[PDB]
Design a protein around this ligand. Structure first.
Ligand SMILES: Nc1ncnc2c1ncn2[C@@H]1O[C@H](COP(=O)(O)OP(=O)(O)CP(=O)(O)O)[C@@H](O)[C@H]1O
Ligand SMILES: Nc1ncnc2c1ncn2[C@@H]1O[C@H](COP(=O)(O)OP(=O)(O)CP(=O)(O)O)[C@@H](O)[C@H]1O
Ligand SMILES: OC[C@H]1O[C@H](O)[C@H](O)[C@@H]1O
Ligand SMILES: OC[C@H]1O[C@H](O)[C@H](O)[C@@H]1O
Ligand SMILES: [Cs+]
Ligand SMILES: [Cs+]
Lengths: 305, 307
């Protein structure tokens, strides 16, 4: 099948489950603590890899021991880590995550080596990006780097897939180069200025994105699935119903598995189905990367449906 | 000529500290500007402030059997602390704290108790002779309530001074408050224990009175920058700190508490003792991290005599 390049961050996630988020000056004690591999780019690369994509990963670790471990792990996740650079004198990214009794989380991130993923590292991968069928990125990498790689993909008819997370505003210049974008509700509001409270809102935020030049807009709607729109023709694809347990990286899982399905030439709806399945398994498991399902598991889930 | 012996009982953590502009909002993700891993824990911080400050101090505590646990034990030994009564709990990891510090320097902390949770009444009871023979016992609320109470009762029956730093904030039973001789709440803890909001010295007087009536002779409610309200059996008095430029106030109270007990064991009167503690903490607030920000006695004297 087609060839995927993911470009994004790598973190070590520290996750503490608690009842309520601490308020300023406060101290709370948690009930479960976990250390695992995270980072939006790595989570997405792992969802692609484990889903069965031909994927290569552009990213940076620091020169430390954790960076060493994550590289070895990534290689076992069906990912070509040849373009994963090692930044001398730099530490591997870290995320500190609190998850409350509802399942809401807040996240603090130490960028470390992720900030060292520069336009010049992108340019060194020109050829790789020019030959890929698709390029998938998020916003935990330097914007200038996302922009440089989007330009190369566009020049070379590589599908640009952008998951605009974490939330922030983005220039028209970037948005015009994107073919598929996957905002959640907060992002869609941040990018279009339209608050997304229902399917009719979803279709409105989508329209503003189609006029920015983006043909395929998917607005994830949490447990309400996704609003999928292709130049203005839109419908909701409900997700599967499961006993959720951990939502971190659900969207990561969804993006990685979406692109995998699309590059197998499955049509959008079959592909969203594939993806919704993968995420639903993911929300029944703990942590980010440990939660990411394998193809066989995603295929066994769909048969059971 | 050594002062009376001090026993510190409480927690030990590895601190993961991320400076950023604004605390993350729900569903939000923010990138910070600085990250640091350091030794922490309220009990360890206080043990180190007392040790560096010159006390004769022994530390009752539990680490896990991981590498961080061994590293913290080695480091504590070099801080003039007797670590003999620091237990290695097999099968557990050392405590961990995740900390965000915002642009002003307000902080938020989530803690995974790990081995700290193993500090049981059986373990305290094994230190019975030690608590009974010490001149003072300093504790906080990062250790299981049952254990703080067992320690307080041993100390009380042997006229070992019980000094309690009631942090993190929570409600305590009368049964414990009756055994305390010196308490050091901040304005938030004072409120949680008395029900009285503390915004000024007058409020502090009221809050102290409730604590005094609960049985606590010496009540020191810290007022951040404004200093401290010191009260003994209802006789209150304000004692200002020093003014300095703040970068990081993690472990400020801890420093205060540790050097406070040290100077009182040196028989310095309360006013001067508090002034010595103020001086330690004021230095501490100009340095990052917790234990790494705690000053040595040499530096405290130099700073006091300077200005
Ligand atoms: N509770 C739930 N039950 C079943 N599926 C769920 C689910 N919550 C999320 N999903 C699936 O995961 C996808 C992403 O959900 P969501 O809108 O919450 O992404 P997100 O912004 O939280 C993502 P991420 O954290 O990786 O960015 C949804 O499209 C849906 O398929
Ligand atoms: N901004 C500041 N400038 C100078 N000294 C300060 C200071 N903030 C705190 N201190 C020192 O620390 C002592 C206690 O401060 P504070 O009331 O903030 O403790 P706290 O319980 O709120 C936090 P913590 O115990 O973690 O420091 C003060 O008496 C003072 O000695
Ligand atoms: O999407 C979840 C991820 O975001 C943050 O990047 C964490 O590292 C976590 O793995
Ligand atoms: O008082 C600051 C300390 O309290 C918390 O317990 C952290 O460990 C930190 O070192
Ligand atoms: Cs998960
Ligand atoms: Cs400090």
């Amino acid at each position: 099948a087609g060839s995927l390049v993911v470009l994004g961050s790598i973190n070590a996630d520290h996750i503490l489950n608690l009842q309520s988020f601490p308020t300023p000056g406060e101290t709370v004690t948690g009930n479960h603590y976990q250390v695992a591999f995270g980072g939006k780019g790595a989570n997405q690369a792992v969802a692609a890899g484990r889903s069965g994509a031909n994927i290569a990963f552009i990213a940076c670790t620091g020169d430390d021991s954790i960076g060493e471990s994550v590289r070895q792990q990534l290689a076992t996740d069906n990912i070509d880590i040849t373009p994963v650079s090692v930044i001398k004198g730099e530490s591997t990214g870290v995320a500190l995550i609190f998850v409350n009794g509802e399942g809401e989380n807040v996240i603090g991130i130490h960028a470390g080596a992720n900030a060292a993923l520069s336009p010049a590292l992108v340019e060194a991968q020109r050829e790789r990006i020019a030959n890929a069928s698709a390029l998938l990125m998020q916003l935990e990498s330097p914007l200038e780097s996302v922009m440089a790689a989007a330009k190369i993909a566009h020049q070379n008819k590589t599908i640009v897939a952008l998951n605009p997370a974490p939330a922030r505003e983005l220039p028209d210049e970037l948005l015009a180069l994107v073919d598929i974008i996957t905002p959640n509700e907060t992002e869609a509001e941040k990018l279009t200025g339209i608050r997304v409270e229902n399917d009719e809102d979803a279709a409105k935020a989508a329209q503003v994105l189609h006029e920015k030049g983006i043909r395929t807009v998917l607005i994830t709607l949490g447990s309400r699935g996704v609003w999928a729109s292709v130049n203005g023709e839109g419908q909701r694809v409900p997700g599967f119903r499961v006993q959720a347990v951990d939502t971190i990286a659900a969207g990561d899982t969804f993006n990685g598995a979406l692109i995998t399905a699309l590059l197998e030439e499955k049509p959008l709806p079959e592909a969203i189905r594939f993806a919704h399945a993968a995420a639903a398994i993911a929300v029944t498991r703990k942590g980010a990367q440990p939660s990411v399902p394998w193809r066989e598991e995603i295929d066994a889930f769909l048969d059971r449906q």
